[PDB]
Amino acid sequence: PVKPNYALKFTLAGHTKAVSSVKFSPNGEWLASSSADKLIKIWGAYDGKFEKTISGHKLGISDVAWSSDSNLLVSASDDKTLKIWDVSSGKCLKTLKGHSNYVFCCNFNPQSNLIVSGSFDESVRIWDVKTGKCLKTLPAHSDPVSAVHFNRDGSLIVSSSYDGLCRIWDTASGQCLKTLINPPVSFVKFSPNGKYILAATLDNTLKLWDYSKGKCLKTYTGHKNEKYCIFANFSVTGGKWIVSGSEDNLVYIWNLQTKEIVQKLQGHTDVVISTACHPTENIIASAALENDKTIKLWKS
Amino acid sequence: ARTTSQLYDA
Protein backbone atom coordinates (compact mmCIF):
# COMPACT_ATOMS: atom_id res chain seq x y z
CA PRO A 1 0.00 0.00 0.00
CA VAL A 2 0.94 3.72 -0.16
CA LYS A 3 -1.56 5.23 2.32
CA PRO A 4 -3.60 3.73 5.18
CA ASN A 5 -7.33 4.21 5.71
CA TYR A 6 -7.46 5.30 9.35
CA ALA A 7 -10.89 6.60 10.34
CA LEU A 8 -12.21 7.46 13.79
CA LYS A 9 -14.58 4.91 15.31
CA PHE A 10 -14.83 5.70 19.03
CA THR A 11 -14.03 8.56 21.41
CA LEU A 12 -13.61 7.47 25.03
CA ALA A 13 -14.48 9.90 27.83
CA GLY A 14 -14.03 9.34 31.54
CA HIS A 15 -10.72 10.76 32.70
CA THR A 16 -11.05 14.06 34.57
CA LYS A 17 -7.45 15.22 33.97
CA ALA A 18 -4.94 14.92 31.14
CA VAL A 19 -4.35 11.40 29.86
CA SER A 20 -0.70 10.33 29.97
CA SER A 21 -0.46 6.94 28.22
CA VAL A 22 -2.53 4.29 26.43
CA LYS A 23 -1.41 0.67 25.99
CA PHE A 24 -3.14 -2.20 24.21
CA SER A 25 -3.28 -5.55 25.95
CA PRO A 26 -0.93 -8.18 24.45
CA ASN A 27 -3.95 -10.42 23.83
CA GLY A 28 -5.46 -7.51 21.82
CA GLU A 29 -8.32 -7.58 24.34
CA TRP A 30 -8.17 -4.43 26.40
CA LEU A 31 -6.76 -0.94 26.28
CA ALA A 32 -5.33 0.52 29.47
CA SER A 33 -5.07 4.29 29.97
CA SER A 34 -3.36 6.29 32.72
CA SER A 35 -4.25 9.85 33.72
CA ALA A 36 -2.96 12.72 35.84
CA ASP A 37 -6.11 12.13 37.96
CA LYS A 38 -4.28 9.23 39.70
CA LEU A 39 -6.44 6.73 37.78
CA ILE A 40 -6.02 3.86 35.35
CA LYS A 41 -8.97 2.92 33.13
CA ILE A 42 -9.49 -0.37 31.28
CA TRP A 43 -11.59 -0.19 28.08
CA GLY A 44 -12.69 -2.70 25.48
CA ALA A 45 -10.44 -2.63 22.44
CA TYR A 46 -13.08 -3.22 19.73
CA ASP A 47 -16.17 -1.47 21.15
CA GLY A 48 -14.61 1.18 23.38
CA LYS A 49 -16.85 0.08 26.24
CA PHE A 50 -15.59 1.26 29.61
CA GLU A 51 -14.92 -1.83 31.71
CA LYS A 52 -13.23 -0.66 34.91
CA THR A 53 -11.27 1.92 36.92
CA ILE A 54 -8.14 1.15 38.94
CA SER A 55 -7.30 3.51 41.81
CA GLY A 56 -4.62 3.60 44.46
CA HIS A 57 -1.86 6.04 43.54
CA LYS A 58 -1.59 9.21 45.61
CA LEU A 59 -0.48 11.40 42.67
CA GLY A 60 -0.68 11.45 38.89
CA ILE A 61 0.46 8.55 36.72
CA SER A 62 2.83 8.95 33.78
CA ASP A 63 2.86 5.46 32.23
CA VAL A 64 1.25 2.01 32.18
CA ALA A 65 2.51 -1.30 30.86
CA TRP A 66 1.01 -4.77 30.52
CA SER A 67 2.25 -8.18 31.46
CA SER A 68 2.87 -10.39 28.41
CA ASP A 69 0.05 -12.69 29.53
CA SER A 70 -2.26 -9.64 29.92
CA ASN A 71 -2.94 -10.44 33.58
CA LEU A 72 -0.82 -7.75 35.29
CA LEU A 73 -0.42 -3.99 34.91
CA VAL A 74 2.41 -1.78 36.14
CA SER A 75 1.99 1.93 36.88
CA ALA A 76 4.56 4.70 37.37
CA SER A 77 3.40 7.63 39.49
CA ASP A 78 4.45 11.03 40.82
CA ASP A 79 4.19 9.57 44.35
CA LYS A 80 7.72 8.21 43.72
CA THR A 81 6.36 4.66 43.39
CA LEU A 82 5.37 2.04 40.87
CA LYS A 83 2.40 -0.25 41.41
CA ILE A 84 1.73 -3.77 40.11
CA TRP A 85 -2.01 -4.43 39.79
CA ASP A 86 -4.07 -7.52 39.06
CA VAL A 87 -6.19 -6.35 36.13
CA SER A 88 -9.15 -8.63 36.80
CA SER A 89 -9.65 -7.92 40.50
CA GLY A 90 -8.28 -4.38 40.19
CA LYS A 91 -6.49 -4.79 43.52
CA CYS A 92 -2.93 -3.56 43.97
CA LEU A 93 -0.68 -6.61 44.14
CA LYS A 94 2.53 -4.75 44.99
CA THR A 95 4.04 -1.29 45.46
CA LEU A 96 7.60 -0.77 44.19
CA LYS A 97 9.29 1.84 46.40
CA GLY A 98 12.79 3.16 45.74
CA HIS A 99 12.88 6.13 43.39
CA SER A 100 13.32 9.48 45.15
CA ASN A 101 11.32 11.53 42.62
CA TYR A 102 8.59 11.17 40.00
CA VAL A 103 8.62 7.85 38.17
CA PHE A 104 8.18 8.68 34.48
CA CYS A 105 8.30 5.39 32.57
CA CYS A 106 7.90 1.66 33.21
CA ASN A 107 7.83 -1.54 31.19
CA PHE A 108 7.73 -5.30 31.68
CA ASN A 109 10.25 -7.55 30.05
CA PRO A 110 8.96 -10.30 27.72
CA GLN A 111 9.24 -12.87 30.54
CA SER A 112 7.31 -10.38 32.73
CA ASN A 113 9.46 -11.40 35.71
CA LEU A 114 11.28 -8.04 35.71
CA ILE A 115 10.14 -4.42 35.52
CA VAL A 116 12.31 -1.55 34.26
CA SER A 117 11.59 1.98 35.48
CA GLY A 118 12.90 5.47 34.84
CA SER A 119 12.40 8.45 37.10
CA PHE A 120 13.14 12.12 37.62
CA ASP A 121 15.92 10.92 39.95
CA GLU A 122 17.90 10.27 36.71
CA SER A 123 18.29 6.55 37.49
CA VAL A 124 16.96 3.39 35.86
CA ARG A 125 15.74 0.67 38.23
CA ILE A 126 15.16 -3.04 37.62
CA TRP A 127 12.61 -4.65 39.95
CA ASP A 128 11.61 -8.27 40.54
CA VAL A 129 7.90 -8.78 39.87
CA LYS A 130 7.46 -11.71 42.24
CA THR A 131 8.87 -9.97 45.33
CA GLY A 132 8.56 -6.30 44.39
CA LYS A 133 12.16 -5.80 45.55
CA CYS A 134 14.53 -3.56 43.62
CA LEU A 135 17.18 -5.71 41.97
CA LYS A 136 19.34 -3.06 40.31
CA THR A 137 19.72 0.73 40.36
CA LEU A 138 21.70 1.90 37.34
CA PRO A 139 22.99 5.50 37.50
CA ALA A 140 21.55 5.87 34.05
CA HIS A 141 21.63 9.58 33.26
CA SER A 142 22.41 13.15 34.32
CA ASP A 143 18.82 14.36 33.91
CA PRO A 144 15.21 13.07 34.12
CA VAL A 145 14.71 9.73 32.35
CA SER A 146 12.06 9.89 29.62
CA ALA A 147 11.66 6.28 28.43
CA VAL A 148 12.75 2.72 29.27
CA HIS A 149 12.18 -0.38 27.15
CA PHE A 150 13.29 -4.00 27.01
CA ASN A 151 14.40 -5.67 23.78
CA ARG A 152 12.71 -8.64 22.09
CA ASP A 153 14.15 -11.32 24.41
CA GLY A 154 14.62 -9.13 27.50
CA SER A 155 18.43 -9.27 27.40
CA LEU A 156 18.82 -5.53 26.71
CA ILE A 157 17.37 -2.32 28.12
CA VAL A 158 17.25 0.99 26.26
CA SER A 159 16.93 4.30 28.10
CA SER A 160 16.61 7.95 27.14
CA SER A 161 16.89 11.17 29.10
CA TYR A 162 16.74 14.96 28.92
CA ASP A 163 20.55 14.91 29.06
CA GLY A 164 20.50 14.08 25.34
CA LEU A 165 21.78 10.50 25.48
CA CYS A 166 20.40 7.10 24.60
CA ARG A 167 21.90 4.10 26.34
CA ILE A 168 21.71 0.33 25.91
CA TRP A 169 22.39 -1.70 29.08
CA ASP A 170 22.90 -5.43 29.60
CA THR A 171 20.03 -6.59 31.81
CA ALA A 172 21.89 -9.40 33.59
CA SER A 173 24.81 -7.23 34.75
CA GLY A 174 23.37 -3.72 34.49
CA GLN A 175 26.44 -2.52 32.62
CA CYS A 176 26.19 0.07 29.85
CA LEU A 177 26.74 -1.62 26.49
CA LYS A 178 26.23 1.33 24.15
CA THR A 179 25.75 5.10 24.23
CA LEU A 180 24.58 7.32 21.37
CA ILE A 181 25.02 11.09 21.88
CA ASN A 182 22.32 17.47 22.25
CA PRO A 183 18.58 18.12 22.37
CA PRO A 184 16.58 16.23 25.01
CA VAL A 185 15.72 12.67 23.96
CA SER A 186 12.06 12.38 24.97
CA PHE A 187 11.26 8.84 23.82
CA VAL A 188 13.05 5.61 22.91
CA LYS A 189 12.04 2.04 22.10
CA PHE A 190 13.27 -1.04 20.27
CA SER A 191 11.98 -2.18 16.90
CA PRO A 192 10.00 -5.45 16.76
CA ASN A 193 13.03 -7.41 15.51
CA GLY A 194 15.24 -5.75 18.15
CA LYS A 195 17.78 -4.55 15.57
CA TYR A 196 16.65 -0.90 15.47
CA ILE A 197 15.77 1.78 18.00
CA LEU A 198 13.23 4.57 17.49
CA ALA A 199 14.18 7.76 19.34
CA ALA A 200 12.27 11.04 19.45
CA THR A 201 14.02 14.31 20.22
CA LEU A 202 12.55 17.62 21.37
CA ASP A 203 13.32 19.23 18.00
CA ASN A 204 10.23 17.89 16.16
CA THR A 205 12.17 14.87 14.94
CA LEU A 206 12.03 11.10 15.11
CA LYS A 207 15.01 8.98 14.17
CA LEU A 208 15.25 5.25 13.52
CA TRP A 209 18.77 4.17 14.49
CA ASP A 210 20.59 0.91 14.03
CA TYR A 211 22.41 0.66 17.37
CA SER A 212 24.41 -2.38 16.18
CA LYS A 213 26.21 0.03 13.84
CA GLY A 214 25.46 3.15 15.92
CA LYS A 215 24.11 4.93 12.84
CA CYS A 216 20.93 6.89 12.11
CA LEU A 217 19.01 5.07 9.36
CA LYS A 218 15.82 7.12 9.01
CA THR A 219 14.54 10.55 10.02
CA TYR A 220 10.86 11.47 10.33
CA THR A 221 9.72 15.10 10.39
CA GLY A 222 6.66 17.24 9.76
CA HIS A 223 5.06 16.95 13.21
CA LYS A 224 5.30 19.19 16.28
CA ASN A 225 7.32 17.99 19.28
CA GLU A 226 9.38 20.41 21.38
CA LYS A 227 8.02 20.16 24.94
CA TYR A 228 6.37 16.82 25.82
CA CYS A 229 7.60 13.21 25.88
CA ILE A 230 5.30 11.73 23.24
CA PHE A 231 5.08 8.00 22.59
CA ALA A 232 5.91 6.60 19.16
CA ASN A 233 5.05 3.20 17.72
CA PHE A 234 5.95 0.82 14.93
CA SER A 235 2.73 -0.17 13.14
CA VAL A 236 3.26 -3.71 11.88
CA THR A 237 -0.19 -5.30 11.51
CA GLY A 238 -0.85 -3.85 8.03
CA GLY A 239 1.59 -1.55 6.27
CA LYS A 240 4.86 -0.78 8.06
CA TRP A 241 4.27 2.68 9.54
CA ILE A 242 5.69 4.98 12.20
CA VAL A 243 2.87 6.51 14.25
CA SER A 244 3.22 9.35 16.75
CA GLY A 245 1.36 12.09 18.55
CA SER A 246 2.01 15.77 18.04
CA GLU A 247 1.64 19.09 19.84
CA ASP A 248 -0.57 20.38 16.99
CA ASN A 249 -3.44 18.02 17.94
CA LEU A 250 -2.68 15.61 15.09
CA VAL A 251 -1.75 11.94 14.86
CA TYR A 252 1.13 11.56 12.40
CA ILE A 253 1.71 8.40 10.36
CA TRP A 254 4.84 8.06 8.20
CA ASN A 255 5.81 5.26 5.86
CA LEU A 256 8.78 3.67 7.60
CA GLN A 257 11.03 3.32 4.54
CA THR A 258 9.93 6.34 2.49
CA LYS A 259 9.77 8.45 5.69
CA GLU A 260 7.12 10.48 3.84
CA ILE A 261 4.04 11.49 5.82
CA VAL A 262 1.28 9.12 4.72
CA GLN A 263 -1.52 10.37 6.97
CA LYS A 264 -2.40 13.04 9.53
CA LEU A 265 -5.37 12.13 11.74
CA GLN A 266 -7.58 15.00 12.93
CA GLY A 267 -9.90 15.07 15.94
CA HIS A 268 -8.18 15.69 19.27
CA THR A 269 -8.37 19.20 20.72
CA ASP A 270 -5.00 19.26 22.52
CA VAL A 271 -1.52 17.72 22.38
CA VAL A 272 -1.82 14.02 21.53
CA ILE A 273 0.60 12.70 24.13
CA SER A 274 0.27 8.94 23.63
CA THR A 275 -0.45 6.52 20.81
CA ALA A 276 -0.61 2.73 20.71
CA CYS A 277 -1.06 0.17 17.93
CA HIS A 278 -3.19 -2.96 18.28
CA PRO A 279 -1.12 -6.19 18.27
CA THR A 280 -3.32 -7.95 15.68
CA GLU A 281 -5.72 -5.47 14.06
CA ASN A 282 -5.10 -2.15 12.32
CA ILE A 283 -6.34 -0.19 15.33
CA ILE A 284 -4.67 2.94 16.73
CA ALA A 285 -5.40 4.38 20.18
CA SER A 286 -4.59 8.06 20.70
CA ALA A 287 -4.68 10.05 23.93
CA ALA A 288 -4.38 13.80 24.48
CA LEU A 289 -3.89 16.19 27.40
CA GLU A 290 -6.37 18.39 29.27
CA ASN A 291 -8.83 20.59 27.36
CA ASP A 292 -9.35 17.22 25.60
CA LYS A 293 -8.71 14.33 28.06
CA THR A 294 -10.28 11.82 25.67
CA ILE A 295 -9.06 8.63 24.03
CA LYS A 296 -9.81 8.09 20.34
CA LEU A 297 -9.82 4.74 18.53
CA TRP A 298 -9.06 4.62 14.80
CA LYS A 299 -9.43 1.70 12.40
CA SER A 300 -7.77 1.06 9.03
CA ALA B 1 4.69 14.62 35.07
CA ARG B 2 4.42 13.55 31.42
CA THR B 3 1.30 15.71 31.09
CA THR B 4 3.16 18.90 32.34
CA SER B 5 5.60 21.47 30.95
CA GLN B 6 7.75 21.63 34.10
CA LEU B 7 11.13 21.00 32.43
CA TYR B 8 10.37 23.23 29.42
CA ASP B 9 9.23 26.06 31.75
CA ALA B 10 12.71 26.58 33.21
Swiss-Prot record, chain A:
Cross-link Glycyl lysine isopeptide (Lys-Gly) (interchain with G-Cter in SUMO2) mapped to chain: 17
Effect of mutating residue 120 to A: Significant decrease in interaction with KMT2A
Residue list for modification N6-acetyllysine: 83
Presence of the UniProt keyword Acetylation in the record: yes
Effect of residue 193 to A: Loss of interaction with RBBP5 and reduced ability to stimulate KMT2A methyltransferase activity in association with RBBP5 and ASH2L
This protein's record includes keyword Repeat: yes
Annotated effect of mutating residue 208 to K: Loss of interaction with RBBP5 and reduced ability to stimulate KMT2A methyltransferase activity in association with RBBP5 and ASH2L
One of the protein's GO biological processes: negative regulation of transcription by RNA polymerase II
Site location (Important for interaction with histone H3): 78, 104, 231, 290
Taxonomy, superkingdom: Eukaryota
Subcellular location(s) of the protein: Nucleus
GO molecular function: histone binding; histone H3K4 methyltransferase activity; histone H3K4me1 reader activity; histone H3Q5ser reader activity
Keywords, comma-separated and alphabetical: Acetylation, Chromatin regulator, Host-virus interaction, Isopeptide bond, Nucleus, Repeat, Transcription, Transcription regulation, Ubl conjugation, WD repeat
Family statement drawn from the similarity comment of this UniProt entry: Belongs to the WD repeat WDR5/wds family.
Subunit structure: Interacts with PAXBP1; the interaction is direct and links a WDR5-containing histone methyltransferase complex to PAX7 and PAX3. Interacts with HCFC1. Component of the ATAC complex, a complex with histone acetyltransferase activity on histones H3 and H4. Component of the SET1 complex, at least composed of the catalytic subunit (SETD1A or SETD1B), WDR5, WDR82, RBBP5, ASH2L/ASH2, CXXC1/CFP1, HCFC1 and DPY30. Core component of several methyltransferase-containing complexes including MLL1/MLL, MLL2/3 (also named ASCOM complex) and MLL4/WBP7.
Chain's role: Contributes to histone modification. May position the N-terminus of histone H3 for efficient trimethylation at 'Lys-4'. As part of the MLL1/MLL complex it is involved in methylation and dimethylation at 'Lys-4' of histone H3. H3 'Lys-4' methylation represents a specific tag for epigenetic transcriptional activation. As part of the NSL complex it may be involved in acetylation of nucleosomal histone H4 on several lysine residues. May regulate osteoblasts differentiation.
Name this polypeptide is given: WD repeat-containing protein 5
Organism the protein comes from: Homo sapiens
Swiss-Prot record, chain B:
Signal sequence residues: none
Processing after translation: Autophosphorylation is inhibited by the apoptotic C-terminus cleavage product of PKN2. Tyr-8 phosphorylation is critical for stabilization of both PDPK1 and the PDPK1/SRC complex via HSP90-mediated protection of PDPK1 degradation. Angiotensin II stimulates the tyrosine phosphorylation of PDPK1 in vascular smooth muscle in a calcium- and SRC-dependent manner.
Distribution of this protein across tissues and organs: Appears to be expressed ubiquitously. The Tyr-8 phosphorylated form is markedly increased in diseased tissue compared with normal tissue from lung, liver, colon and breast.
Subcellular location(s) per record: Cytoplasm; Nucleus; Cell membrane; Cell junction, Focal adhesion
Expression induction: Stimulated by insulin, and the oxidants hydrogen peroxide and peroxovanadate.
Annotated positions of the Phosphotyrosine modification: 8
Function per UniProt: Serine/threonine kinase which acts as a master kinase, phosphorylating and activating a subgroup of the AGC family of protein kinases. Its targets include: protein kinase B (PKB/AKT1, PKB/AKT2, PKB/AKT3), p70 ribosomal protein S6 kinase (RPS6KB1), p90 ribosomal protein S6 kinase (RPS6KA1, RPS6KA2 and RPS6KA3), cyclic AMP-dependent protein kinase (PRKACA), protein kinase C (PRKCD and PRKCZ), serum and glucocorticoid-inducible kinase (SGK1, SGK2 and SGK3), p21-activated kinase-1 (PAK1), TSSK3, protein kinase PKN (PKN1 and PKN2).
Comment, domains: The PH domain plays a pivotal role in the localization and nuclear import of PDPK1 and is also essential for its homodimerization. The PIF-pocket is a small lobe in the catalytic domain required by the enzyme for the binding to the hydrophobic motif of its substrates. It is an allosteric regulatory site that can accommodate small compounds acting as allosteric inhibitors.
Record note on quaternary structure: Homodimer in its autoinhibited state. Active as monomer. Interacts with NPRL2, PPARG, PAK1, PTK2B, GRB14, PKN1 (via C-terminus), STRAP and IKKB. The Tyr-8 phosphorylated form interacts with SRC, RASA1 and CRK (via their SH2 domains). Interacts with SGK3 in a phosphorylation-dependent manner. The tyrosine-phosphorylated form interacts with PTPN6. Binds INSR in response to insulin. Interacts (via PH domain) with SMAD3, SMAD4 and SMAD7.
Family from the record: Belongs to the protein kinase superfamily. AGC Ser/Thr protein kinase family. PDPK1 subfamily.
The name this protein goes by in its record: 3-phosphoinositide-dependent protein kinase 1
